[PDB]
Amino acid sequence: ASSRVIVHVDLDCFYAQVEMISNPELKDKPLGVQQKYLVVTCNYEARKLGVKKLMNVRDAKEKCPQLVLVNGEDLTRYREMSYKVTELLEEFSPVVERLGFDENFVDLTEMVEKRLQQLQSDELSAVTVSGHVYNNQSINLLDVLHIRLLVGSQIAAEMREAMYNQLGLTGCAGVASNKLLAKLVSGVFKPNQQTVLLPESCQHLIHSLNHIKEIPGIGYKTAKCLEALGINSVRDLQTFSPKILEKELGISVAQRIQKLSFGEDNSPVILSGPPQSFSEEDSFKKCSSEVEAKNKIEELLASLLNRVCQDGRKPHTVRLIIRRYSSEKHYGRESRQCPIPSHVIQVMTPMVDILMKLFRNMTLLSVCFCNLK
Amino acid sequence: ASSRVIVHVDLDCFYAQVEMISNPELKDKPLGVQQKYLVVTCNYEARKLGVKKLMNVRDAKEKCPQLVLVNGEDLTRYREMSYKVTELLEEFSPVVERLGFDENFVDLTEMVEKRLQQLQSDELSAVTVSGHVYNNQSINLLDVLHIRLLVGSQIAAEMREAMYNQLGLTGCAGVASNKLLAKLVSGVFKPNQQTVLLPESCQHLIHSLNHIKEIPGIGYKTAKCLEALGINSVRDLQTFSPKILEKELGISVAQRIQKLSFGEDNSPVILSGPPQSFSEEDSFKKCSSEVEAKNKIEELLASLLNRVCQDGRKPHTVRLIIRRYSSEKHYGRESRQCPIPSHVIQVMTPMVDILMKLFRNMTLLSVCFCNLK
DNA sequence: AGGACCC
DNA sequence: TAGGGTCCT
DNA sequence: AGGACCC
DNA sequence: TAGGGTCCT
Ligand SMILES: Cc1cn([C@H]2C[C@H](O)[C@@H](COP(=O)(O)OP(=O)(O)OP(=O)(O)O)O2)c(=O)[nH]c1=O
Ligand SMILES: Cc1cn([C@H]2C[C@H](O)[C@@H](COP(=O)(O)OP(=O)(O)OP(=O)(O)O)O2)c(=O)[nH]c1=O
Ligand SMILES: [Mg+2]
Ligand SMILES: [Mg+2]
Ligand SMILES: [Mg+2]
Ligand SMILES: [Mg+2]
Q1: Which residues are recorded as binding Mn(2+) (chains A, B)?
Q2: Which of A12, A31, A53, B260 is the most exposed place for a label (fewest CB within 10 A)?
């Protein structure tokens, strides 16, 4: 139980893909999906004309005045397609980890080894790769690790074929020996393709990054910190003093981000299984007076009730969340959590009143059901 | 799945019992178990001379200058006897809930019904109670609920017999239709006896309480609150306005404590299973300079390492906890949590250094291992 | 992290 | 005024 | 409850 | 500048 083969699958322009499948007339047209004033994502025809992901509508329509826009506020169809994808991959190997609605990690290590024991001592010389080899690295067919990664590339090609034939969806895959590297290498050939990373190329891939914010796991906060410390490239982070860093971000945050700077990441792929919460949200900037706005709370509820329902399990907790306006409080949401009374779990009319009183102990409103059973 | 039969088992003067079993020469002598300046508990010979539970040593030895004292700082033997008791009860019925080291709830409902279907349509008239009937209530052998509670009293008598024959331990049991009432009724005949509560006596038992702090679930805090609201007896709490209370303690805290004031409590008996944390502590008032005291941290560790070991499972988290002195900050402990590095989980010498740095980001010190797997 | 509650 | 422990926000 | 991180 | 989601302190 040492060397792993992991694949990271990452779909193309996910919400746009789903909209292009719904209305074929949007294909071959530059297409953005809009949520409020945000073009959250756009198909590849639109990225040709300069549309980037997460541009405001304005910036997007003066970079490209001909861009089609569809509303993507309601996530229901993206969410349903996201679970179809995960459940397809779970069929190849049960332990599938989701990240957001369009990425899945799968530990192929068992599956690769069982294919290897199926091949006789001969056809092992005919193993080839499927897709690109990062940094155009030469393969050595006598290196057991290259062999396993290539079988891994083949599983990846079958998963993406299946996603295409069964669900109509294209995407990218990255095959590597842990999750960090599979997820970095899945973006190297962007549109609907796959890349495999051999160990000799690990430092090349990790040094190809131009800022430590690009390392999955280093966020808006830790990045700003690392800077204030003159740590700007991945190599600065690799060479920086362990102690200074230990004693500045916690043992935890420090010992881990420094591993990742090397390309080292031992986190297992975890079975995501069913969601741990179900929430809906609404944005409406400056609209919530402060009592004329609980209706809103009923809207949220309406959908939520249907969703939480359907799963099977019932939630044992309810939560209410807000924010408010003046200057750029860069972070500042508030919430009040409470247990859902047992009579109520077995509908609307009291829920509402749990929320209303929760709302009282109290730009934007949401409701979250959590603690499912 | 409506009416339940629950038993609450509550051992006599637990730590003292254990000490009296270790050193028989302490029997028939008034015995207190001491932790620092606190006589945490005392056997029944000592309660005759005025020793109460949780008296200071001073107050205890001038109420009773002849009282024997043994040190109970080290909990190891009380903890081991506590699990022997729980595992014995789990043998009667698997779902056993612990509360502290010497109380266990068991849902006898399945066990009672299967004994009932074993008795032919005749010997059902010969069912008798074992132990006391709260408030000396008359039994009605044609009341299915009285019958089930009496079979429940008989299971209770077998559990306490078994605890005595197998482990040498005496205790009390309370049989009732939910956990609140079984735990209130287990103290009515205190020393080594058992009481059963029939439904007609529920209001009598709940009104026998002299302050709402006595209701399991209403603590130091909510009690002081309830007062500031003129709510002093259980009847005040029962009659108080639901809304005023809803809108003053949360929907949660309010709707629940008001049920309990009635004797109503639907919480299931939960399987406690293995512990969710392992911690040790040390008190030493004014002793921790502020660097001369990490040794202390090594001591804690030493035992902890042995305990967490033994279970099987390993902990994935470590925590450090403190407090400090001036005036009576009535609540004020602090802690810094961090993940235990994966190399380390498979010993002392780095642990120490996780703690030491945790101690730096930072009257009394403790270490807690949690998040077991 | 800390709060609140239990033994 | 000890030395533990549980679950919630 | 809130923080921090991800898509 | 959206609408979701996960796990930790
Ligand atoms: C990062 C991010 C994505 N999304 C949504 C929109 C995306 O279509 C979807 C997937 O995120 P991504 O995979 O980052 O974006 P993408 O699939 O749209 O584009 P690409 O082809 O480069 O992979 O999740 C958000 O709504 N908010 C976010 O901040
Ligand atoms: C309440 C409490 C108990 N204990 C310990 C000492 C006790 O022996 C043990 C059990 O608690 P209890 O059952 O309340 O006390 P007891 O068994 O000693 O006395 P009784 O015969 O009245 O039931 O837990 C503490 O250490 N601290 C506490 O605050
Ligand atoms: Mg992505
Ligand atoms: Mg994508
Ligand atoms: Mg007790
Ligand atoms: Mg006791």
Answers
A1: 10-11, 102
A2: A53
